[PDB]
């Protein structure tokens, strides 16, 4: 009945020294029934990465919408959109549906190509921006993720250390949520290289 | 000349030529007569055929039990205006339980015709109407022009050669106004009036159209052998 917990799933993002990380589980379900273990929730438009939790039809719709908008942006601006600018576009787009909203929890992650500064941001279903220095969480196990991140996180972690921290944050949070799991992906993002890693985890 | 292309243009002498041209269509139409006493009101109309195989074009239209008109000019325009009168008579009865006064019916027709003389895109109506009726103030006769001008009269005529009938009624004024409680004699006076406008042709059984309304007489139209009595 509650649209934000029909399909399940989680996303988490973190900042490190000259890098950012964003990660998500791979489950899609119909309440109790597990339907897919390959439903990735992280997308990217140029060097800007977007994770989306919540109602899966809206996850797909918003990805298609932001691909649409960032493609037109690039054609007109003659440059790729930056994380700070894209964050405002997500907020604007969500608020235009104020009284008929998309039931989602978006998360933005990326590095500004000009300043080199790591950037992350989170939103509620209607556009309110949470721009944290440390970490952003979203999904049906957000409480669990808040608990993991608050204890595991420390500032200025090197890329390969940040990978271990965010991976352990996701995995252990997902294992305490019925509607999350069935695989996981972690993106490690540096100024001009991005590595994608699929994690081995329990499949119940 | 340069000022007759549309109804939205005055001439240098302050004339509206499109309205005057619409008035001309009435003069080409067949003659119809209207006259009244204090108890009854009568319409007499000369119907026109296309040829010997054709029917004679109807000239009189009923608007309500107490009101109706006769036409001269563009017949489809009379259908539009009579339909509007039927609706207005009907609105008055349904909403106010009131029979629409003949004078008020004239005011409504004036205002409807006026809007077509001051706006771009439209055109004036190309028909003249004679409205008779019996209401709370007795018998009435009205003459409508598509310029918007509506006039209350004892008697009148419109159409081709209508001047002959109009002069006759102007002479007979004192006689026919006194024909109270005698429908047949009032119609006789109307048939004699329309006869002053005939040339070459005479009033036959499928040529003549008569209508009457009065104190205890609903608006009724007579055609065919029903008018042989008056030929």
């Amino acid at each position: 009945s509650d649209p934000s917990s029909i399909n399940g799933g989680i996303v988490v993002a973190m900042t490190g020294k000259d890098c950012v990380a964003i990660a998500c589980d791979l489950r899609l379900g119909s309440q109790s029934l597990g339907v897919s273990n390959k439903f990735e929730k992280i997308f990217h438009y140029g060097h800007v990465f977007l994770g989306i939790t919540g109602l899966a039809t809206d996850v797909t719709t918003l990805n298609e919408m932001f691909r649409y908008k960032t493609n037109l942006y690039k054609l007109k601006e003659e440059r790729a959109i930056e994380p700070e600018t894209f964050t405002q576009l997500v907020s604007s787009s969500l608020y235009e549906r104020r009284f008929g909203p998309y039931f989602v929890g978006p998360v933005v992650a990326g590095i500004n190509s000009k300043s080199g500064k790591p950037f992350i941001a989170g939103f509620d279903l209607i556009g309110c921006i949470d721009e944290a220095k440390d970490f952003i969480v979203s999904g049906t196990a957000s409480d669990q993720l808040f608990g993991m991140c608050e204890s595991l996180y420390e500032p200025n972690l090197e890329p390969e250390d940040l990978f271990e921290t965010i991976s352990q944050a996701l995995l252990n949070a997902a294992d305490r949520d019925a509607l999350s799991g069935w695989g996981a992906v972690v993106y490690i993002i540096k100024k001009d290289e991005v590595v994608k890693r699929y994690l081995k985890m329990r499949q119940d | 000349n340069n000022y007759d292309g549309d109804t939205v243009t005055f001439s240098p002498t302050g004339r509206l030529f499109q309205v005057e041209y619409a008035l001309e269509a009435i003069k080409q139409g067949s003659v119809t007569v209207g006259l009244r006493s204090n108890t009854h009101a009568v319409l007499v109309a000369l119907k026109r055929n296309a040829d010997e195989l054709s029917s004679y074009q109807k000239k009189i239209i009923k608007c309500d039990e107490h009101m109706g008109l006769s036409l001269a000019g563009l017949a489809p325009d009379a259908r539009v205006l009579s339909n509007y009168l039927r609706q207005q008579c009907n609105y008055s009865s349904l909403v106010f339980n009131r029979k629409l006064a003949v004078e008020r019916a004239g005011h409504l027709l004036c205002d409807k015709a006026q809007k077509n003389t001051q706006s771009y895109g439209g055109r004036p109506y190309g028909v003249g109407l004679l409205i008779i009726g019996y209401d709370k103030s007795g018998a009435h006769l009205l003459e409508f022009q598509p310029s918007g001008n509506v006039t209350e009269l004892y008697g009148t005529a419109i159409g081709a050669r209508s001047q002959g009938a109009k002069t006759y009624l102007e002479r007979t004024l004192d006689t026919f106004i006194k024909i109270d409680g005698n429908p047949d004699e009032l119609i006789k006076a109307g048939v004699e009036a329309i006869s002053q406008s005939l040339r070459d042709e005479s009033l036959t059984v499928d040529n003549l159209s008569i209508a009457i309304v009065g104190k205890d007489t609903p608006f009724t139209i007579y055609d065919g052998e029903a008018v042989a009595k008056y030929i």
Binding site: - | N2, Y3, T7, V8, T9, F10, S11, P12, T13, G14, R15, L16, E103, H107, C110, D111, A113, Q114, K115, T117, Q118, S119, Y120, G121, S147, G148, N149, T151, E152, L153, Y154, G155, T156, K166, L169, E170, L173
Partner: protein, 243 residues
């Protein structure tokens, strides 16, 4: 040239020729007048008897707006009726929102703005009437005259139609000979005389006189038609003066 073929076009003079042509239709119409008296206004009009077949006293020309305003006009009669219909809508909406009956200066501008609006576009034709109107409100009596251009002013006396020059001269005499003012009953008598005198420009056909008035003392500030004995008395006074 061609500046006079379309409404709302400025000529090289800065003139709207279509509005000036509408004035020609007004000048072609019958004579109508208005007289401002001590506590009200009087309106009168010439009605040409085209034929004996016209029913006397039936084709009424003067029109009431609300219950306190009278309107008379010369030119295209249907155009005048259209303007009065709008005036009645304006007066109704004013009273609906503000409760009090529309003041005469307020009513004047409502007609003025509407007539002016018909000089702004080529998709409409200007009004072919000059309208004399007025009545009594909380600040007293008011008389106005409104032209095809939308132009209007307040008047002590007003006249329009074919016999306007004759009428104006008669009105000017009354203003000079009565600086203190004219009574309502006097104004009715004078209005009858002026129409009879102005009928010389239309002397071919005979006519019918029609008078109305609004007076604080005589009609309680309501618009009424002059009828019966008071009308005959005014006709007699008028006939005596022309002989």
């Amino acid at each position: 040239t061609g500046y006079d073929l379309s409404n709302s076009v400025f000529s090289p003079d800065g003139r709207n020729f279509q509005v000036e042509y509408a004035v020609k239709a007004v000048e072609n119409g019958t004579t109508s007048i208005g007289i401002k008296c001590n506590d009200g206004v009087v309106f009168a009009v010439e009605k040409l008897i085209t034929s004996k077949l016209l029913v006397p006293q039936k084709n009424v020309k003067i029109q009431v707006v609300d219950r306190h305003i009278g309107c008379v006009y010369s030119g295209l009669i249907p155009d005048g009726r259209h303007l009065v219909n709008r005036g009645r809508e304006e007066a109704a909406s004013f009273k609906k929102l503000y409760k009090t009956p529309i003041p005469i200066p307020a009513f004047a501008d409502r007609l003025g703005q509407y007539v002016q609006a018909h000089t702004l576009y080529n998709s409409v034709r200007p009004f072919g009437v000059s309208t004399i109107f007025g009545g009594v409100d909380k600040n007293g009596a008011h008389l106005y005259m409104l032209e095809p251009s939308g132009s209007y002013w307040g008047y002590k006396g007003a006249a329009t139609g074919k016999g306007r020059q004759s009428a104006k001269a008669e009105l000017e005499k009354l203003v000079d000979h009565h600086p203190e003012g004219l009574s309502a009953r006097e104004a009715v008598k004078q209005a009858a005389k002026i129409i009879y005198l102005a009928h010389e420009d239309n002397k071919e056909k005979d006519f019918e006189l029609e008078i109305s008035w609004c007076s604080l003392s005589e009609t309680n500030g309501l618009h009424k038609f002059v009828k019966g004995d008071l009308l005959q008395e005014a006709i007699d006074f008028a006939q005596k003066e022309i002989n």
